[PDB]
Amino acid sequence: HWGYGKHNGPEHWHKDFPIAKGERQSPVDIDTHTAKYDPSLKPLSVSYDQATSLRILNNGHAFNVEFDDSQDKAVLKGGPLDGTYRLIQFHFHWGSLDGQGSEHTVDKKKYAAELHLVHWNTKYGDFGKAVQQPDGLAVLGIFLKVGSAKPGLQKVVDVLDSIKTKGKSADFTNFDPRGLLPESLDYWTYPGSLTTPPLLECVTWIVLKEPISVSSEQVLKFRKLNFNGEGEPEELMVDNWRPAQPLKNRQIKASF
């Protein structure tokens, strides 16, 4: 199946997922000089005070922190969005070295990693129906650079040794995603897709301009995870990111 290696990586995805060559693919390079301030964007609203995490899972291409989204709780609204989008999960993409790992780039700069906080449009009733709609998901993308440690990330880092290999999961309650957010909510936004198969063109991307800092030790622990399952030859889970894709007929708007 699909992956990040020479024979199943991003250059191969279009064969099973022809949308890989579609008109609103992600990620993209954000040209900060060409992105235009949009005064019609409404204030962005990230309301995570009631977020309830359930579980953390190694799915063989990243790790997912999943939330109980059965009630109206952790909500993203405002900005480019119409209506309300409910937090369902987060995951990261990261590199083998600090100089690469992010999906989006900023004037061609690659960050060490990128956090994706995934929300679904409540007008569609659940996630599986939302992903079939062009406005079904809102993904808040946050860059990670290596420097000072992020205290709010440590609880994630410490659990990763219990989910080293594909298919392992662990209880992960009471995690507060507010501890993963930078000070500023300044953002760029554009219409795009998932950055992994099935590459569905259902995402309003909201990419924060301000990165969060994580320590070298924290990201090194991300890089100790495995793509393979238990009892299989070890392939370190690193470089689970896709090259930037053509912007095609799209505009990136700035909130600032």
Ligand SMILES: S=c1[nH]c(-c2ccccc2)cs1
């Ligand atoms: S990359 C990105 N991957 C997702 C996702 C969330 C749940 C299931 C499948 C994919 C949103 S952005």
Ligand SMILES: [Zn+2]
């Ligand atoms: Zn992602």
